[PDB]
């Protein structure tokens, strides 16, 4: 069973990427390993983590427990053939698959699951098999497995309502979308605060609310941030118990740019060490900052950079450098004059921006189609 296992992965990461963080999780992760008679995590964990030179006794005893359980399950299979119910051998191997998946490695679990997928004639059991496969894919980050299982589940759930399974699949799909750099679909799929969050396997509700507010700050704009995330009764009730996130949202919405930076720094520190946000934790930040810059200049026309010093954050040189490096990137359409320190605004037409994207997508597709054309015909 993979209901408690997800947390283990986090601890693993907390020892790999964080250089100095190697003292706290090292004991409770090993406690979780010594419980359940684990053997999967430390074929390579001992290699990557500390040597743990005094380990052979535990290894041998855990192995012997593994063969004991496997032999008992096989003898249950053998007893089950002679007097079968729904081919009770197949229910027995379904029961063995969870243990093999929890203790053993991936290939044995996958083979057992693909063997037992051919027994069930009920749709719910097939959906449960698919959910185990998806959870394993999330645990070990297998892109093809995740994609194939997601499309198979979406095809299979069409028969029969099963709206609970639909909500669970939506949460899983949102987690996968936010795992990659796709925040639009992640914030779109995270509208299940009111349509139930019974998927307590992956996480608790409070983390779900924090994730959904974090992605809603990226994906959507003011006329919707004022309609869905600031007016929601349930999200506001939950947020009332989290002063930091409420402050971080109200600071941006109420246009208190001075206090915004402290919350932004704290949040990015939090998500740097956090799972499934680390590999691009910088990119998120590089939006919010520039986003705030684009949320102030659009009202005035000739605001001086002196005002921004006390209104946005101290340091005229810092603001000058940031503004210059963001102008050079082609976004944040404005202009700055340094002889008199004056910022001017402009309004480019929405046809130039809607043209380079077409040309670049065309270039990429042409390269791909030429490669395809000359792969064939030697």
């Amino acid at each position: 069973p993979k209901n408690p296992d997800l947390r283990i992965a986090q601890l693993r990461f907390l020892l790999s990427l964080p250089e100095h963080r190697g003292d706290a999780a090292v004991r409770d992760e090993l406690m979780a390993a010594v419980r359940d008679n684990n053997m999967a995590p430390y074929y390579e964990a001992l290699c990557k983590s500390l040597d743990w030179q005094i380990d052979v006794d535990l290894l041998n005893k855990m192995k012997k427990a593994n063969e004991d359980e496997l032999k008992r399950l096989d003898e249950e299979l053998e007893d089950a053939e002679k007097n079968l119910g729904e081919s009770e051998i197949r229910d027995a191997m379904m029961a063995k698959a969870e243990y093999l998946c929890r203790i053993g490695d991936k290939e044995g679990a996958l083979t057992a699951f693909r063997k037992t997928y051919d027994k069930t004639v009920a749709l719910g059991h097939r959906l449960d098999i698919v959910f185990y496969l998806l959870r394993i894919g999330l645990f070990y980050m297998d892109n093809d497995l995740i994609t194939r299982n997601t499309e198979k589940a979406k095809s299979l759930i069409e028969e029969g309502g099963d709206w609970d399974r639909r909500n669970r699949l939506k949460v899983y799909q949102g987690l996968y979308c936010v795992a990659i750099r796709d925040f639009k679909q992640a914030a779109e799929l995270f509208l299940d605060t009111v349509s139930t969050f019974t998927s307590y396997e992956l996480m608790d509700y409070k983390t779900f609310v924090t994730y959904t507010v974090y992605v809603s700050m990226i994906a959507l704009e003011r006329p919707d941030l004022r309609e869905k995330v600031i007016k929601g009764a349930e999200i506001l009730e939950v947020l009332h118990s989290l002063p930091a996130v409420r402050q971080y949202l109200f600071s941006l919405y109420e246009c208190r740019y001075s206090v915004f930076f402290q919350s932004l720094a704290v949040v990015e520190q939090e998500m740097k060490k956090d799972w499934l946000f680390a590999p691009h934790y910088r990119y998120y930040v590089r939006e919010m900052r520039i986003h705030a810059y684009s949320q102030l200049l659009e009202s005035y026309r000739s605001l001086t950079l002196g005002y921004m010093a006390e209104a946005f954050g101290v340091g005229v040189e810092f603001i000058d450098q940031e503004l210059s490096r963001f102008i050079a990137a082609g976004r944040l359409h404005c202009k700055i004059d340094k002889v008199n320190e004056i910022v001017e605004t402009n309004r480019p037409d929405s046809k130039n921006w809607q043209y380079q994207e077409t040309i670049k997508k065309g270039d990429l597709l042409l390269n791909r189609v030429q490669k395809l054309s000359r792969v064939i015909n030697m």
Binding site: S302, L365, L372, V375
Partner: protein
């Protein structure tokens, strides 16, 4: 709040009002059609390369 598009000038306290043309609806359909064509070209690999 995008219910009124113009601009404000603080030097003389002057509200400038201007209009903008509606967004062209021809391009975005072409963009997502290009994306669909990219998906089709991607799918052609499994049909072609699997025996060559």
């Amino acid at each position: 709040d995008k219910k009124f598009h113009g601009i404000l000038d603080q030097g003389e306290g002057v509200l400038i009002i201007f209009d903008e043309p509606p967004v062209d609806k021809t391009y975005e359909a072409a963009l997502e059609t290009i994306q669909n064509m990219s998906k089709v070209v991607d799918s052609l690999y499994n049909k072609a390369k699997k025996l060559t």
